[PDB]
Amino acid sequence: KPAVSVLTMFRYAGWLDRLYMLVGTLAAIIHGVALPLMMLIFGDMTDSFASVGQVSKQSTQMSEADKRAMFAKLEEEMTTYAYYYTGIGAGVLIVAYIQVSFWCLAAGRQIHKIRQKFFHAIMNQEIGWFDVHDVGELNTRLTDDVSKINEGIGDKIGMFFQAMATFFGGFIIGFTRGWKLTLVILAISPVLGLSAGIWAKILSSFTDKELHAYAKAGAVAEEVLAAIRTVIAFGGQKKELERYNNNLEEAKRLGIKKAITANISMGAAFLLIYASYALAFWYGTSLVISKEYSIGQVLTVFFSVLIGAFSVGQASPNIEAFANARGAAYEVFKIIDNKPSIDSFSKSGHKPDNIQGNLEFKNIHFSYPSRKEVQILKGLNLKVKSGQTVALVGNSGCGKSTTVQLMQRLYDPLDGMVSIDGQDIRTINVRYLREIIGVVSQEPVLFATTIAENIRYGREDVTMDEIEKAVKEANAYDFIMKLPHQFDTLVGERGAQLSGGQKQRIAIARALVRNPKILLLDEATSALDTESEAVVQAALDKAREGRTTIVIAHRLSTVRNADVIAGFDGGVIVEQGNHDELMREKGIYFKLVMTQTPPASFWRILKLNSTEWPYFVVGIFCAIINGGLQPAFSVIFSKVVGVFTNGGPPETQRQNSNLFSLLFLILGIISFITFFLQGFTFGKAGEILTKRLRYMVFKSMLRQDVSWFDDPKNTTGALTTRLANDAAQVKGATGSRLAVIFQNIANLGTGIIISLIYGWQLTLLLLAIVPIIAIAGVVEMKMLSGQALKDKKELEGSGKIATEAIENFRTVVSLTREQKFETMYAQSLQIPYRNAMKKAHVFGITFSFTQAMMYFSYAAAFRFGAYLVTQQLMTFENVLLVFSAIVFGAMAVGQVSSFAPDYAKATVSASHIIRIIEKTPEIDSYSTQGLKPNMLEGNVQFSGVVFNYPTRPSIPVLQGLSLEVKKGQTLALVGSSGCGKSTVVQLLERFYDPMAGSVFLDGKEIKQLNVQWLRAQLGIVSQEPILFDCSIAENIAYGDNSRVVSYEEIVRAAKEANIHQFIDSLPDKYNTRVGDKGTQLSGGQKQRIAIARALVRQPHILLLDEATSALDTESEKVVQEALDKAREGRTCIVIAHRLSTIQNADLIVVIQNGKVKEHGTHQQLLAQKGIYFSMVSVQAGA
Ligand SMILES: Brc1ccc(Oc2c(Br)cc(Br)cc2Br)c(Br)c1
């Protein structure tokens, strides 16, 4: 919404930039006017053949005389028009270079200025300015918004004025050469602007419907793929597939309905657009039979008006480009023009010499740019004598640090003054102020250069002698000499990451070259290892005694040797003096001392598409028809002008033009009959394979074992995204692009035969001409993208040192040296600048030479056309036919290069979608093999089980584990921490097979058992029960699949789980919907339902994985009261973290390091005094 004044945006154009834009936009208007003149001459060449085509047919008496006066008219006329044509092509050769080169010159020159000025302004902002903005957004604003300005002040403006020139020049030649046809072509323009306006309404309303259609199927997939371990546990893998398949049937029906309506929209749109042209050209013939216009003039205005009418649309993007460039220049010029109060670039203020360093803070009230919400200093008083070292202490608030901020004049105080020596800090130059103040902060930062360069950021003029003395005087010399490369080592966020106390000493040496008169030490010793602390503290004490120092820390070890100590309480200075005196004061200071003591040939995706052997052949056949049917419209146009230039007797003409105009309206309805079929057939054929793909993909996804969904590469979001993209892309590869790529090769294929057989070698010329200008247009775009990628590579090096500059900026401004980054960034930009000058000459040459090859080509179209072919018996009516046939057959192949990324984008989406079907798991739930034993009672054997999770094969969770539980017994399971408690349940569910050892149930190894049958006698109940969006009756009936569960049977389970209080209390009862979509209810109810569905199954084994994890108050008392009833009649394994409820367990087992450590009944393990005795004592006391 905000924009910029049109002059202020070009504020950096002067002298030459103003001239380049003028000569550029001048030649840009010359370039535009050339094309309607190029069509003006096309009309005069018609009358030349027309004055001869009418007299050649008017004879029927003399033949050698028609070889004289006729051919003489031609060679004087044709060579006159051919001379003009070659001149127009030489004209656009020059002006197109002048056009694009100059504007890209003016843009390149300005954008170089924008950048330097804009980064300059970023570094000139006071710290209170950054405290309210994001440096991340600002940096991205620096590289993106400057790019948008370049796009709007570049060759796009020259293009804008080229288009308006064709618009004006088109309707000038339109109006002047005839005021009737123009008003007629403008009358059908509302119809053309109304037919394309139906597409802005159908697309935007149906692209939502499809995004609302699959959103109903993707919602099923997401609660499934998020609750996958619950559907795997209960084996709903057939239902959740079926339910996803039931939503795929509706999206197919809504996709075929969209395919019906959208293809009706295109065909009727073209047929209205092509009828609107017909009537404008038929009614152009109706005015030549009346002898008002010539057959040549009808062509001139008809083209010049349509050319001029369509230049309106070819300019609208450049308007938007210039407009986006204005609005983007707002927030950028806003920074450049914003003048600060502090500067730090200002060359003003006093530079006191012989600074003794007597500092005082008087009545300083202050607040950070959070402003009225918080006031951190409620007045202040604090001197510090020269040479002394004051120490600031405080419990919280850190108004301690605030005095360091103010002393650097980072912010000015709200009320009061900070006085270095006798002068207010605000009289002294801000730069000289920060040069006479060294700073050592809590987090040290070193810039991505050498040690000598980081030390050189203290002073730019320095010799390794003084670097050596500085690092040696901050005892930081002994420890870099051992480090290789000596002073030439690297530092940064990338490479050679050093110790904290090591990084601080380089900062002290950096501040030591500064030889400052003032010293500010904020938190420098805090947050650092204890041993290297003393090494740095030795340097801090050696960095003082020659200076006056204010120090802030929480280490009460560095404060004793301070001459004076200051304490705060609510921003108020409260307690000051020497160490011994504050201890006698027994106040705030004393109170704190005691406290601290792969692209490839994928044929099979088409082989799966071969499920529909028809539907394609219906479309292909129907597309080649429409392909062959499309040059015939040019053949009709050739003969509507042909027989009416080759007329002779004018009486038979009016009756044939009526017959031709009737044919084309029959030929367009049969084109709309054949266009609708080629779209509907692929539309239906593409939507039905989208079901087959998404069906087969979602199937093989439920096939994979838990080992695959734990992969951080495959999350629930990344799987539905992989589910929707890969199936939509392959539809596009086999969809519209294929119908169009076969329509167009039939378009040229049928047009190449018609033209070839009329004009002998006439067509053989254009086939030496057209493929060259098409290749020349493609190599231009390859050079376009090459210059684009190369410039991105070398401006990000500039923005990389800008990134380092602006998000490490509160440090650099403390060090001054903004002029450093100022110059580095300037040297960084000098390469893309001198590059952008070549870009102007490159773009200008390529564009001018793809434009010249269009007019020189069309100069050669009439070079054969006349002279060598017209001195022969071959006719004019065929030269017009070959021009329209070949050039339009060529521009139809120009659609092949546009649909190229649609093929590759799908093959890569196909690359992943064929792999995801064929990938087989270690533990496939689908295998029907397995024992399916007959005996009911259930035991459980773990025997020497070692197992690590495949995601993290580092820390073992189970190693040498061995358990056993009898039927009807409760096996408690206590663990120090981790999933060692929980991994047991996962292995009994055979989520994974163990690495070593084995797990048995009824005496049989589950690893040889049926995977699905095993999970069928297991009553899993987790700590967060997930319930799908459907009836609670179904959430409860979900526990027993392969059979619909009776109402009174899911009632009996709801009776067991003690959830039946709600299940009658709700208005819908069992038919109520849960899933945070229909109704919401707390976890205690969610949980009981999970218990309900757990024992619908009537398992022989319950599995209670910390079932009282997230639960409170009476809700825990009622859930355990249900769990305790659900067991005792079944084999039970409970790992619940409530050891109170675990007392009445038939066997408790303590897990230690994966090994079983301590087992026995409660009082047994309680008689022993060890881990279980401590596990129970720690929770009972606390
Ligand atoms: Br009759 C008649 C035939 C083609 C005409 O222009 C064309 C041409 Br030329 C090519 C195609 Br494809 C469609 C149309 Br509409 C006109 Br205007 C009138």
Short mmCIF file of C-alpha atoms in Angstrom, two decimals, residues 668-988:
data_model
loop_
_atom_site.label_atom_id
_atom_site.label_comp_id
_atom_site.label_asym_id
_atom_site.label_seq_id
_atom_site.Cartn_x
_atom_site.Cartn_y
_atom_site.Cartn_z
CA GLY A 668 -14.58 -23.86 -35.16
CA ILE A 669 -17.54 -25.79 -33.77
CA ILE A 670 -15.85 -29.02 -34.86
CA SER A 671 -12.71 -27.61 -33.20
CA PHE A 672 -14.70 -27.02 -30.01
CA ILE A 673 -16.24 -30.48 -30.40
CA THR A 674 -12.72 -31.91 -30.74
CA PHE A 675 -11.23 -29.64 -28.08
CA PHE A 676 -13.69 -30.66 -25.35
CA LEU A 677 -12.94 -34.34 -25.95
CA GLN A 678 -9.15 -34.05 -25.73
CA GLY A 679 -9.52 -32.32 -22.35
CA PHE A 680 -12.20 -34.46 -20.73
CA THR A 681 -10.48 -37.70 -21.71
CA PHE A 682 -7.16 -36.82 -20.09
CA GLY A 683 -8.97 -35.14 -17.20
CA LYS A 684 -10.85 -38.32 -16.32
CA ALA A 685 -7.80 -40.47 -17.08
CA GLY A 686 -5.64 -38.31 -14.80
CA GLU A 687 -8.07 -38.19 -11.88
CA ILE A 688 -8.57 -41.95 -11.77
CA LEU A 689 -4.84 -42.69 -11.64
CA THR A 690 -4.61 -40.11 -8.84
CA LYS A 691 -6.83 -42.44 -6.81
CA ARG A 692 -4.84 -45.53 -7.84
CA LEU A 693 -1.57 -43.82 -6.89
CA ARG A 694 -2.80 -42.37 -3.59
CA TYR A 695 -4.48 -45.70 -2.86
CA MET A 696 -1.38 -47.80 -3.55
CA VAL A 697 0.87 -45.26 -1.80
CA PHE A 698 -1.27 -45.02 1.33
CA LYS A 699 -1.44 -48.84 1.28
CA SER A 700 2.33 -49.41 1.20
CA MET A 701 2.67 -46.68 3.85
CA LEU A 702 0.53 -48.62 6.32
CA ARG A 703 2.65 -51.64 5.32
CA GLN A 704 5.90 -50.28 6.76
CA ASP A 705 6.83 -51.17 10.32
CA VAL A 706 7.39 -48.76 13.21
CA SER A 707 11.08 -48.67 12.19
CA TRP A 708 10.14 -46.48 9.20
CA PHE A 709 7.78 -43.93 10.77
CA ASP A 710 10.34 -43.11 13.48
CA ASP A 711 12.72 -41.78 10.82
CA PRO A 712 13.15 -38.00 11.27
CA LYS A 713 13.11 -37.88 7.46
CA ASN A 714 9.46 -39.07 7.44
CA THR A 715 7.17 -37.07 9.73
CA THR A 716 3.38 -36.92 9.54
CA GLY A 717 3.54 -33.59 7.71
CA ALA A 718 6.32 -34.65 5.34
CA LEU A 719 4.37 -37.82 4.51
CA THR A 720 1.02 -36.23 3.63
CA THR A 721 3.00 -33.63 1.68
CA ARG A 722 4.85 -36.48 -0.05
CA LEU A 723 1.42 -38.09 -0.49
CA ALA A 724 -0.28 -35.11 -2.18
CA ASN A 725 2.56 -33.66 -4.28
CA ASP A 726 3.81 -36.84 -5.95
CA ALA A 727 0.28 -37.85 -7.05
CA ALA A 728 -0.67 -34.41 -8.34
CA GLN A 729 2.54 -34.02 -10.36
CA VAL A 730 2.32 -37.30 -12.29
CA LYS A 731 -1.22 -36.28 -13.27
CA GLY A 732 0.20 -33.16 -14.91
CA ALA A 733 2.84 -35.11 -16.84
CA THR A 734 0.25 -37.45 -18.36
CA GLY A 735 -2.36 -34.67 -18.49
CA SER A 736 -2.69 -31.44 -20.43
CA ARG A 737 0.94 -31.10 -21.54
CA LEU A 738 0.72 -34.40 -23.44
CA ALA A 739 -2.51 -33.50 -25.24
CA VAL A 740 -0.98 -30.15 -26.17
CA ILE A 741 2.41 -31.55 -27.19
CA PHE A 742 0.63 -33.95 -29.56
CA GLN A 743 -1.84 -31.32 -30.77
CA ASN A 744 1.07 -29.05 -31.66
CA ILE A 745 3.24 -31.62 -33.44
CA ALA A 746 0.08 -32.41 -35.41
CA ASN A 747 -0.47 -28.66 -35.77
CA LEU A 748 2.95 -28.24 -37.36
CA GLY A 749 2.89 -31.72 -38.89
CA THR A 750 -0.30 -31.08 -40.85
CA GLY A 751 0.75 -27.49 -41.51
CA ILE A 752 4.18 -28.54 -42.75
CA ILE A 753 2.70 -30.86 -45.38
CA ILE A 754 0.19 -28.33 -46.74
CA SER A 755 2.83 -25.61 -47.04
CA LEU A 756 5.51 -27.95 -48.41
CA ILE A 757 3.34 -29.25 -51.26
CA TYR A 758 2.11 -25.83 -52.41
CA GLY A 759 5.32 -23.80 -52.30
CA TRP A 760 8.17 -25.97 -53.56
CA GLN A 761 11.29 -24.94 -51.60
CA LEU A 762 9.32 -21.88 -50.47
CA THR A 763 8.64 -23.94 -47.35
CA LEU A 764 12.17 -25.37 -47.44
CA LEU A 765 13.40 -21.81 -46.87
CA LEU A 766 11.30 -21.10 -43.76
CA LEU A 767 12.42 -24.45 -42.32
CA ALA A 768 15.98 -23.18 -42.59
CA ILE A 769 14.84 -19.91 -41.00
CA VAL A 770 12.30 -20.78 -38.28
CA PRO A 771 14.30 -23.43 -36.34
CA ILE A 772 17.15 -20.92 -36.05
CA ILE A 773 15.12 -18.07 -34.54
CA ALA A 774 13.58 -20.59 -32.13
CA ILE A 775 16.99 -21.90 -31.06
CA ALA A 776 18.28 -18.33 -30.89
CA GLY A 777 15.39 -17.53 -28.54
CA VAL A 778 16.27 -20.46 -26.28
CA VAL A 779 20.01 -19.75 -26.06
CA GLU A 780 19.04 -16.22 -24.99
CA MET A 781 17.11 -17.59 -22.02
CA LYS A 782 19.99 -19.93 -21.13
CA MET A 783 22.31 -16.90 -21.12
CA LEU A 784 19.60 -15.10 -19.13
CA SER A 785 19.54 -17.75 -16.40
CA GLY A 786 23.33 -18.09 -16.45
CA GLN A 787 23.78 -14.38 -15.78
CA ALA A 788 21.07 -14.71 -13.12
CA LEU A 789 22.68 -17.58 -11.20
CA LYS A 790 26.16 -16.04 -11.44
CA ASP A 791 25.02 -12.69 -10.02
CA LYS A 792 23.23 -14.41 -7.13
CA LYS A 793 26.47 -16.21 -6.26
CA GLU A 794 28.59 -13.07 -5.98
CA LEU A 795 26.18 -10.68 -4.28
CA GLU A 796 25.60 -13.11 -1.40
CA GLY A 797 29.26 -12.67 -0.50
CA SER A 798 28.51 -8.98 -0.03
CA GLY A 799 25.34 -9.68 1.97
CA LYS A 800 27.31 -12.26 3.97
CA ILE A 801 29.65 -9.59 5.38
CA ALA A 802 26.56 -7.42 5.73
CA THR A 803 24.96 -10.24 7.72
CA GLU A 804 28.03 -10.45 9.97
CA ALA A 805 27.87 -6.65 10.18
CA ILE A 806 24.26 -6.13 11.21
CA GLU A 807 23.50 -9.06 13.52
CA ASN A 808 26.81 -8.60 15.33
CA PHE A 809 26.23 -4.85 15.22
CA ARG A 810 25.87 -3.89 18.89
CA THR A 811 29.45 -5.18 19.22
CA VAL A 812 30.97 -3.39 16.22
CA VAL A 813 29.40 -0.07 17.20
CA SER A 814 31.07 -0.54 20.60
CA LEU A 815 34.30 -1.00 18.64
CA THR A 816 33.47 1.85 16.21
CA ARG A 817 34.92 0.58 12.88
CA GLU A 818 31.60 0.87 11.07
CA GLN A 819 33.72 2.46 8.34
CA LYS A 820 35.48 -0.92 8.10
CA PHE A 821 32.33 -2.85 7.18
CA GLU A 822 31.37 0.27 5.23
CA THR A 823 34.39 -0.21 2.95
CA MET A 824 34.44 -4.02 2.89
CA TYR A 825 30.86 -3.97 1.66
CA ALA A 826 31.82 -1.35 -0.93
CA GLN A 827 34.72 -3.43 -2.24
CA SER A 828 32.38 -6.43 -2.23
CA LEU A 829 29.93 -4.60 -4.51
CA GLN A 830 32.53 -3.35 -7.00
CA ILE A 831 32.57 -6.74 -8.76
CA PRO A 832 28.78 -7.02 -9.38
CA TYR A 833 28.73 -3.36 -10.45
CA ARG A 834 31.35 -3.80 -13.18
CA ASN A 835 29.53 -7.05 -13.94
CA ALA A 836 26.20 -5.24 -14.31
CA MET A 837 27.78 -3.00 -16.96
CA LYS A 838 28.49 -6.07 -19.11
CA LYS A 839 24.95 -7.30 -18.44
CA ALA A 840 23.62 -4.20 -20.20
CA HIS A 841 25.65 -4.92 -23.33
CA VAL A 842 24.87 -8.65 -23.15
CA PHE A 843 21.09 -8.23 -22.81
CA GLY A 844 21.09 -5.52 -25.48
CA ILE A 845 22.90 -7.70 -28.01
CA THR A 846 20.86 -10.85 -27.38
CA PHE A 847 17.51 -9.04 -27.46
CA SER A 848 18.34 -6.92 -30.52
CA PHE A 849 19.65 -10.00 -32.33
CA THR A 850 16.55 -12.07 -31.58
CA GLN A 851 14.44 -9.17 -32.88
CA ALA A 852 16.52 -8.65 -36.03
CA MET A 853 16.28 -12.37 -36.81
CA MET A 854 12.50 -11.92 -36.77
CA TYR A 855 12.33 -9.10 -39.32
CA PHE A 856 15.20 -10.34 -41.49
CA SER A 857 13.42 -13.71 -41.47
CA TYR A 858 10.15 -12.07 -42.53
CA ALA A 859 12.10 -10.09 -45.10
CA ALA A 860 13.21 -13.45 -46.50
CA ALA A 861 9.62 -14.73 -46.37
CA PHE A 862 8.79 -12.35 -49.24
CA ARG A 863 12.18 -12.77 -50.93
CA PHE A 864 11.16 -16.24 -52.04
CA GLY A 865 7.53 -15.06 -51.94
CA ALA A 866 8.18 -12.63 -54.77
CA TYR A 867 10.97 -12.54 -57.36
CA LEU A 868 12.17 -16.12 -57.75
CA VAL A 869 8.75 -17.68 -57.08
CA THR A 870 6.46 -14.99 -58.41
CA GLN A 871 8.38 -14.56 -61.67
CA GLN A 872 7.55 -18.27 -61.87
CA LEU A 873 3.93 -19.45 -62.11
CA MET A 874 3.53 -19.83 -58.33
CA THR A 875 0.99 -17.52 -56.76
CA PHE A 876 0.54 -14.99 -53.96
CA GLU A 877 -2.36 -16.88 -52.34
CA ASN A 878 0.05 -19.66 -51.33
CA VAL A 879 2.79 -17.44 -49.88
CA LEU A 880 0.29 -16.05 -47.38
CA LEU A 881 -0.76 -19.61 -46.53
CA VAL A 882 2.77 -20.79 -45.76
CA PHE A 883 3.52 -17.71 -43.64
CA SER A 884 0.52 -18.33 -41.37
CA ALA A 885 0.93 -22.11 -41.35
CA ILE A 886 4.64 -22.31 -40.54
CA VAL A 887 4.87 -19.35 -38.15
CA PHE A 888 1.80 -20.44 -36.19
CA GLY A 889 2.87 -24.07 -36.35
CA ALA A 890 6.18 -22.86 -34.92
CA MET A 891 4.63 -20.80 -32.11
CA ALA A 892 2.63 -23.92 -31.22
CA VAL A 893 5.93 -25.77 -30.72
CA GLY A 894 6.86 -22.78 -28.56
CA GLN A 895 4.45 -24.35 -26.05
CA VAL A 896 6.66 -27.45 -25.84
CA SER A 897 9.45 -25.46 -24.20
CA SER A 898 7.01 -24.02 -21.63
CA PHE A 899 5.65 -27.38 -20.45
CA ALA A 900 9.16 -28.82 -20.02
CA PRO A 901 9.40 -28.22 -16.22
CA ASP A 902 6.00 -29.90 -15.77
CA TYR A 903 7.53 -33.14 -17.07
CA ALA A 904 10.67 -33.01 -14.91
CA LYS A 905 8.80 -31.83 -11.81
CA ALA A 906 6.61 -34.91 -12.15
CA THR A 907 9.38 -37.42 -12.88
CA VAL A 908 11.12 -36.40 -9.66
CA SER A 909 7.74 -36.68 -7.93
CA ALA A 910 7.41 -40.01 -9.74
CA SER A 911 10.93 -40.98 -8.65
CA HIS A 912 9.84 -40.92 -5.00
CA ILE A 913 6.41 -42.46 -5.58
CA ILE A 914 7.60 -45.66 -7.27
CA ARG A 915 10.17 -46.20 -4.50
CA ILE A 916 7.62 -45.71 -1.71
CA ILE A 917 5.41 -48.50 -3.08
CA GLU A 918 8.16 -51.10 -3.55
CA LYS A 919 9.95 -50.55 -0.22
CA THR A 920 9.18 -53.56 1.98
CA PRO A 921 9.48 -53.69 5.79
CA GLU A 922 11.25 -56.11 8.09
CA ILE A 923 7.95 -56.74 9.90
CA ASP A 924 5.11 -56.64 7.35
CA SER A 925 1.67 -56.71 8.95
CA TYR A 926 0.29 -57.85 5.59
CA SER A 927 1.97 -61.27 5.51
CA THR A 928 -0.64 -63.99 6.01
CA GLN A 929 2.09 -66.41 7.11
CA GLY A 930 2.37 -67.23 10.80
CA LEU A 931 1.29 -69.95 13.22
CA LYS A 932 -2.04 -68.71 14.67
CA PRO A 933 -1.95 -71.00 17.75
CA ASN A 934 -5.10 -72.49 19.23
CA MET A 935 -4.37 -72.35 22.98
CA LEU A 936 -5.77 -69.48 24.98
CA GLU A 937 -3.69 -68.97 28.13
CA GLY A 938 -0.83 -66.52 27.89
CA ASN A 939 2.73 -66.37 29.24
CA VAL A 940 5.53 -63.95 28.32
CA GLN A 941 9.25 -64.74 27.95
CA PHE A 942 12.00 -62.21 27.63
CA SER A 943 15.36 -63.99 27.52
CA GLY A 944 18.64 -62.11 27.14
CA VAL A 945 17.05 -59.35 25.07
CA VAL A 946 19.45 -56.74 23.71
CA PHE A 947 17.84 -54.02 21.61
CA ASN A 948 18.69 -50.50 20.46
CA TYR A 949 16.34 -48.18 18.58
CA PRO A 950 17.29 -48.06 14.87
CA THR A 951 17.05 -44.26 14.87
CA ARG A 952 19.63 -43.88 17.67
CA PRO A 953 21.95 -46.91 17.67
CA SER A 954 24.10 -45.13 20.26
CA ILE A 955 22.81 -45.40 23.84
CA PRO A 956 21.40 -48.89 24.51
CA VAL A 957 18.04 -49.13 26.24
CA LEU A 958 17.80 -52.93 26.60
CA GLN A 959 20.81 -55.21 27.07
CA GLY A 960 20.56 -58.63 28.68
CA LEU A 961 16.94 -58.32 29.82
CA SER A 962 15.01 -61.37 31.02
CA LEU A 963 11.46 -61.54 32.38
CA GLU A 964 8.62 -64.00 32.81
CA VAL A 965 5.00 -63.57 33.91
CA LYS A 966 2.34 -66.23 34.45
CA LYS A 967 -1.23 -65.97 33.22
CA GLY A 968 -3.61 -63.88 35.30
CA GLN A 969 -0.69 -62.22 37.08
CA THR A 970 0.23 -58.55 37.16
CA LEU A 971 3.86 -57.89 36.15
CA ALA A 972 4.88 -54.51 37.51
CA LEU A 973 7.80 -52.78 35.80
CA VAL A 974 9.81 -50.04 37.53
CA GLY A 975 12.70 -48.24 35.87
CA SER A 976 15.21 -45.56 36.71
CA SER A 977 14.17 -43.59 33.59
CA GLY A 978 13.87 -43.88 29.80
CA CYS A 979 11.86 -46.31 27.68
CA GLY A 980 13.45 -49.36 29.32
CA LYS A 981 10.14 -49.47 31.13
CA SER A 982 8.31 -48.82 27.84
CA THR A 983 10.41 -50.76 25.31
CA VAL A 984 9.05 -53.99 26.84
CA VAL A 985 5.53 -53.17 25.65
CA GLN A 986 6.76 -52.24 22.17
CA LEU A 987 8.59 -55.55 21.77
CA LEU A 988 5.61 -57.62 22.94
#
